[PDB]
Amino acid sequence: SPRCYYCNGPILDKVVTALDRTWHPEHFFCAQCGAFFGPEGFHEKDGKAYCRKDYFDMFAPKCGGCARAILENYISALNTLWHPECFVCRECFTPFVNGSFFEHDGQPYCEVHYHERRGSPEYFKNG
Ligand SMILES: [Zn+2]
Numbered sequence: 001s002p003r004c005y006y007c008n009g010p011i012l013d014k015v016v017t018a019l020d021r022t023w024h025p026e027h028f029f030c031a032q033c034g035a036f037f038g039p040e041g042f043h044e045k046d047g048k049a050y051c052r053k054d055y056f057d058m059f060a061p062k063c064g065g066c067a068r069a070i071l072e073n074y075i076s077a078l079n080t081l082w083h084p085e086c087f088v089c090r091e092c093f094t095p096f097v098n099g100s101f102f103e104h105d106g107q108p109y110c111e112v113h114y115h116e117r118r119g120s121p122e123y124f125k126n127g
Pocket residue numbers: 004005006007008009023024027
């Protein structure tokens with residue numbers, strides 16, 4: 001049976017396969033972002049485990065789904081790096097110089113637009 005070398009102990013529950021070796025679930029964590037739940041097909045580097053996103057980070061910042069190479073200015077949000085201008089609501093489409101990054105429905109939003117969305121459950125007079 002498989003044995004967790006990280007704690008030199010036996011493995012009863014689900015065993016994770018890495019570097020042709022067996023490791024425990026609680027003893028197995030991404031050494032890059034350290035926060036996995038249940039991905040599929042990860043890349044190995046230097047005997048380490050990196051998420052799909054971490055793999056790209058090692059090379060360069062890329063938009064989740066806009067472009068490849070990101071200019072100088074960049075913004076790290078949702079564990080992913082996206083362009084500075086890409087950070088805009090699908091309605092305003094314009095950036096709102098403020099500072100912190102706002103996340104909404106897995107997409108970038110403005111400070112006023114972000115709070116305005118949480119203001120009401122469905123809609124309201126303002127907006
Ligand atoms: Zn272990």
